[PDB]
Amino acid sequence: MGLNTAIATRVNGTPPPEVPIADIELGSLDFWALDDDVRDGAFATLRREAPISFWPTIELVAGNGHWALTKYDDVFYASRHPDIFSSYPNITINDQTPELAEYFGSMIVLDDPRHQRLRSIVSRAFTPKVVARIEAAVRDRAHRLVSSMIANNPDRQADLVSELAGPLPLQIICDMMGIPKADHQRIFHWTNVILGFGDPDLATDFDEFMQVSADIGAYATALAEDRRVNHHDDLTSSLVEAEVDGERLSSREIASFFILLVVAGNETTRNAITHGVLALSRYPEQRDRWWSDFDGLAPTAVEEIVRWASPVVYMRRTLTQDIELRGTKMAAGDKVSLWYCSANRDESKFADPWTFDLARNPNPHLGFGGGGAHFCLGANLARREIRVAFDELRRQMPDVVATEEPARLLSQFIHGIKTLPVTWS
């Protein structure tokens, strides 16, 4: 009904309501359904009263529980000490088998030296011609998707997720890899079934999920085998040709890197853009400031959108040895969860953490993690994707605004918005 009228604004800088520590149940799915004000107040209570605490996994096999690190300094320290806080082979709270974790996770589930081998050769594949292709695709696909929003919608209403934030990062990944247009339908279907496993409200058939995950891997392996014969100016070809000290990637390694990208390089940028449109809709003075000086404010605006959205809520590690932090003794083998959503509101680190300030500087947020060995390999591409999406909104539909509160994804790991209706003139 009200899909033609702007959502309520909020007063910028307002802290979340006080949340009693007894109300906080990180191991309960019902807790993850509470809205972001209750969640943000919950992590505020933990930072203040119980900054390291142990929680059960969400069940629905219950596994071992995890120590939640909620303070910026603890998440930073854990990120920079991977010999103690290991990523091998699990980076979510629920454990996967090592072979499945490596198949879907590529370098993100490895420690050095295997991680550094893989990351160094992948990094070398981002050659000048490949980077030029990627940068042209970001602008082409953002411009087309926003133009299509206008062409497809005489009522000037659309769902930002389905029409812009959802397709943009996966179309860019298709273009970067050199995937033909005619294969988008298969890549989107496979990717949507894989992502859907992360949504407990969307039925995921197990057999269908295993078969799409085999097919997408076979598809990327065949794409790499073709580029071994036929060099194109795309990332698949530079991945097959890249070499560090004689070491080269197998086609199987390339395929798993692609499977990592269609999740980790895709739903994260989607949610940064959708939370950024939500935030501009709640704080229109920030939208006005940015539009008044788009290029001058873009570098700090994009970082503040990532700090504010924290699209990756947490990453997990596993202790290789006993450690005591803040007086809390944790044992070798224990799970540790690193709450970037909470680090990104830590009052010791950020002046006025509840203010959404697109001029914020400095902004040492941990939305791409705490830094160190696994620091987001796509961070510069994500920053460009965010900037150019907002640039195309500003150029083509500058008053675009959310018209209904978002439908939120029920997830502990992904700060997901499933739908965000918008309207424009």
* Contact set with ligand HEM (CB under 6 A): 79, 107-108, 119, 260-261, 264-265, 268-269, 272, 306, 311-312, 315, 367-370, 374-378, 381-382
The answer to the question of whether 341 is labelled as a binding residue is no
The tokens describing 120, both together, are 């160094």
The tokens describing 180, both together, are 């033909």
- The distance of closest approach from Cβ of residue 412 to ligand HEM in the complex, given in angstroms and rounded to an integer, is 14
State which residue has the least CB distance to ligand HEM. 378
The tokens describing 351, both together, are 């002046």
- The distance of closest approach from Cβ of residue 298 to ligand HEM in the complex, given in angstroms and rounded to an integer, is 15
Query: What CA–CA distance (Å, rounded) separates 167 from 198?
Result: 18
Cis bond leading into 89, ω under 30°? Answer: yes
3-class secondary structure, 333:
coil
Query: What CA–CA distance (Å, rounded) separates 209 from 213?
Result: 6
Q: Which is nearer to ligand HEM, 51 or 367 (CB)?
A: 367
Q: Which is nearer to ligand HEM, 51 or 311 (CB)?
A: 311
Q: Which is nearer to ligand HEM, 308 or 404 (CB)?
A: 308
- The distance of closest approach from Cβ of residue 115 to ligand HEM in the complex, given in angstroms and rounded to an integer, is 6
Q: Which is nearer to ligand HEM, 235 or 323 (CB)?
A: 235
**What DSSP character marks residue 119?**
H
Query: What CA–CA distance (Å, rounded) separates 327 from 324?
Result: 6
Q: Which is nearer to ligand HEM, 19 or 313 (CB)?
A: 313
Q: Which is nearer to ligand HEM, 39 or 374 (CB)?
A: 374
- The distance of closest approach from Cβ of residue 18 to ligand HEM in the complex, given in angstroms and rounded to an integer, is 28
Q: Which is nearer to ligand HEM, 7 or 138 (CB)?
A: 138
The tokens describing 370, both together, are 């705490």
- The distance of closest approach from Cβ of residue 382 to ligand HEM in the complex, given in angstroms and rounded to an integer, is 4
Sheet holding 85-86, edge to edge: 52-55, 66-69, 335-339, 314-319, 85-86
- The distance of closest approach from Cβ of residue 378 to ligand HEM in the complex, given in angstroms and rounded to an integer, is 2
Among 209, 194, 203, 200, CA closest to 58: 200
Q: Residue 222's CB: how many other CB atoms inside 10 A?
A: 12
Sheet holding 421-423, edge to edge: 157-159, 421-423, 401-402
Q: Which is nearer to ligand HEM, 16 or 265 (CB)?
A: 265
Q: Tell how far CA 404 is from the center of its chain.
A: 23
DSSP conformation letters of 138-177 = HHHHHHHHHHHHHHH-TTSEEEHIIIIITHHHHHHHHHHH
- The distance of closest approach from Cβ of residue 137 to ligand HEM in the complex, given in angstroms and rounded to an integer, is 12
Query: What CA–CA distance (Å, rounded) separates 157 from 178?
Result: 33
**What DSSP character marks residue 414?**
B
- The distance of closest approach from Cβ of residue 277 to ligand HEM in the complex, given in angstroms and rounded to an integer, is 14
3-class secondary structure, 107:
helix
Q: Which residues are annotated as a binding site for heme?
A: 376
Q: Which residues are annotated as a binding site?
A: 376
